[PDB]
Amino acid sequence: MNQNLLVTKRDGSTERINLDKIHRVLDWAAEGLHNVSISQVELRSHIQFYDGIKTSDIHETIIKAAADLISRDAPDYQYLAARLAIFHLRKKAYGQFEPPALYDHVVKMVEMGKYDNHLLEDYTEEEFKQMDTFIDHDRDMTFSYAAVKQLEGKYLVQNRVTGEIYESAQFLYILVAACLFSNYPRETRLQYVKRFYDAVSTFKISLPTPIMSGVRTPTRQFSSCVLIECGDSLDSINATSSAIVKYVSQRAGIGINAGRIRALGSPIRGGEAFHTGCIPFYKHFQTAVKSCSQGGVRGGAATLFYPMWHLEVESLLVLKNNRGVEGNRVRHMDYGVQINKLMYTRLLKGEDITLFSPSDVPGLYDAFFADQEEFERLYTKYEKDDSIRKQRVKAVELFSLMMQERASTGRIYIQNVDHCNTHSPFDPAIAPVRQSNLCLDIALPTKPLNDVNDENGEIALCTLSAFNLGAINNLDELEELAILAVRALDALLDYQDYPIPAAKRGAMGRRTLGIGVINFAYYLAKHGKRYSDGSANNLTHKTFEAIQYYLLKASNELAKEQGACPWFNETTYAKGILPIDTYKKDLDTIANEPLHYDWEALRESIKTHGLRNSTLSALMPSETSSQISNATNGIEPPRGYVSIKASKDGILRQVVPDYEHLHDAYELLWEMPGNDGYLQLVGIMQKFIDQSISANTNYDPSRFPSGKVPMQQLLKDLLTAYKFGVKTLYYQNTRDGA
Template sequence: VNDLSDVSLTDVEINAKINIHEGITTKEIHNLLIESAANLISVEKPNYQFVAGRLLNYQLRKDVWKGKHAPRLSEFLNQGIKNKIYDPIILENYSEDEINKLGEFIDHERDYNFTYAGIKQLCDKYLIKDRVTGKIYETPQFAYILIAAYAFAKYPAETRLSYVRKFYDAISKHKINLPTPVMAGVRTSSRNYASCCLIGVDDTKDSITASATAVSMATANRCGIGIDVSKIRAVGSPIKNGEVVHTGLIPFLKIYESSVKAWQQNGLRGGSATCNIQWWHYEIEDVVVLKNNAGTDDNRVRKLDYTVGMSKLFYDRVLKDEDIILFNNAEVPELYEAWGTKDFDKVYKECESKKLKIKKKISARKLFSLIVKERVETGRIYILNVDHANEHGAWSDKVTMSNLCT
């Protein structure tokens, strides 16, 4: 701690109030010292966050390395592969000499730059561990170099080591952050690095059930979910020539809610999903209130978030205090096909003049006020300005939905 000002190891020892007794373990003493240093962190003496962080780092090294000195990367990696911690595919991509070279890139001194909160977060969420026993299998710099090595494994052999080094330096010096699936997943056998997954749902039994499965699988693989339910037909719609009456969106949203909450993101955190619905959907008024505390569990779906797709036409009618028509997608599928394109306004106006079984006229301002009210009260109603997303986005495909990450 010689490089830290306004810290005292004596104060850490005194504050720990260690009661030495027969049978007390060195690990228990170490934990008390970590807790003591953490309790000394204050606005006046912020450097205790580094003292506590280093004490936690020393304990981590002792547990993982079984001593003071770091093992060679090749030994550490091979043992991890043997214990089924790391993906063995890396041995197919890198030679032994290359792995030894990667080991030379590692600077374990960079662990000392962690604050207590930083390294604790790493231990709790991102380092590979047995989440039943709590046993951690790696230290930060080994995790960083392996993330870099796996990420660039398919690059040309002539240049990839330089890419690995640059990337390792950037993440180990905390110049860039990595999303959770990359930080926790790259180097494991899961081979799933996506943070976000967008799922479009068609108006069929097969699509609705398949999308629920996709939500479950994606959540289990650490993805945050965006679901577009705007194609699902409106409540009261006929099915099989009127043999069945459609139950509407809410029962299906409950399925997605259950799918998301039944799975954890690979043990790291609970699943999450954002349902997208366009402003012109027949059930928009019922969907935007699903998050609030009114109503009952039967008519609320509170564990999902909601995004309302907006467009210039809607905003224009709000400003002019004009009415809008809410539609059933099953009757006007061309409306969704035009959503997010320059043709939408024209198609929408054509649909307004059609004679349809299920449609509803409401005030644009009334709907906008309802959306704003729910957004203010719950904080979990989001807006996607689809015209801007398509005009200014870098994507060649049409954007119709999003999720909280993007």
């Protein structure tokens, strides 16, 4: 008759219940949302309250209650839940809802060793006072629950033992800004910090996880992926391996080119025993890749590339096929099969494909990537020469074998090596592109190492970022954003540390960046286009010309200011060649949109003052970044309207952006009748992209007689992709609802 319910506080222990405090907080969180029942939430959580429960559990419980009502039909629960979680997270880090002033926060964090001390060196208290005036902690209210789950899970600075969270998303953004523009002239430094801060807090520009979790802290390791090229020698094999180990110990995705390793049977090169072949070494790279992961299998990912005509290609192609002898399988690494014009022509004419160990055909490997003419000449030449060890395979058998394996595992990727060299930012004769990275979006020059510390080797890196096509109003907002993206990344290049000499060489030499988009799908839904009918062709053309033009304008602008990258002379850019001059011709047949930009003015501006960065665009996939922004992933159509994630904290649901008004506008992944629509769009994007795009092929067995995908369809799609100049092909998904 005074039946209370004692809440317990952070060692302040006992106290009565405050069900009106709670309601106030809920009420607040609900402000502006539509279709959310505060009572419903209260009922669901009050029922699990027990007499001496700590306050932190009252919050988790109201948070989960809200999260569990998220649905297609009631999507504002995602904000109600996030807002509660944000509120809780404030109290958890600061003891109040109101964040401490920035200077005080930074000072306390530097004493605690959670923020780099250089922050206080590079900026004055008055400078921090001013940044604080740019900050808007109410943007914390725009995150969706899944977004807060990710920030909380892997962005915000915290203690991973105790669980203690030390910061709010706005301090993350403001300090990422500050660190990246810390070396700017006092004259412009803070205007840049503010402009970027705004761009990232309002989700216009997304940034990779290592960057958002680390810049501001004492580390200097921000690598997401590297590209190493193995020479045909124990020294290189050793170096390659060494390099992989250092790089996976920093969580980087690895893309390895082991195409030149000579084939099984070849003669000993004075002490180097490659009699045994590629596989034993591949195994060795796999163990290197997995050296710093959980069981010896969990975590650490790589993709290994090799020419289609390699002598052991038929053994290589079935490396992840589970039914087979243990010794002849390297299952936990994806492969990237490298193909060019001549290979496909042999398929089309039903002729043979000749396998050869690279060791035995002088000049063939290089020609393969850099000069098709010459490749054709040496190829036919060596076919005829009977001194040369070789093997003949029916091109149809070889192609189907590879498509088959690509079909089953989903992880046998294609790389059109002529397309990456005839349509690239680089000169193939001096710095050809002979491999991709883990997710087949990166395409840069690499040189083999002779020792881990070899200064004449080159390792390519992933320096990434992305435009939210869902958060810009017109494409002319991309000029400001290109500036801010390019400048921040370029700064990062000098900010971070390089574990291997050859990886420093590549970054400082070519300053290569890979900026792409996210939210494509939602962008097309708001403009009433679809992926599979070809209705989005000109819009895509318009959107990717604007992205590329402004990126080049921003980089050109930057070279003016601070000088072109040291090896700018090895680019086609240097010679007055533009992406619009070398794209694959057939594109002309599927899109008429005219260039809206002065490419000729920029051509000269580029020839004259050069480019800060040798590459600027690359369309990578993005789960995390996309989630924080509540956006569809990179350029992929959504699988369905609500996507589910698991957690220790219950089921996380996230509804596609503006489902309310665009459910009929979206074209879900399995609603596309086939791949042509999408492959065209990828081809159009590739006109302007410097690097590559992680494109997927998707098949639904329901759509085929007897539930079997014809090898004909698989080859036709493959050839469709090559015909519209697609550089790479990534995942292949099979199924009809996920």
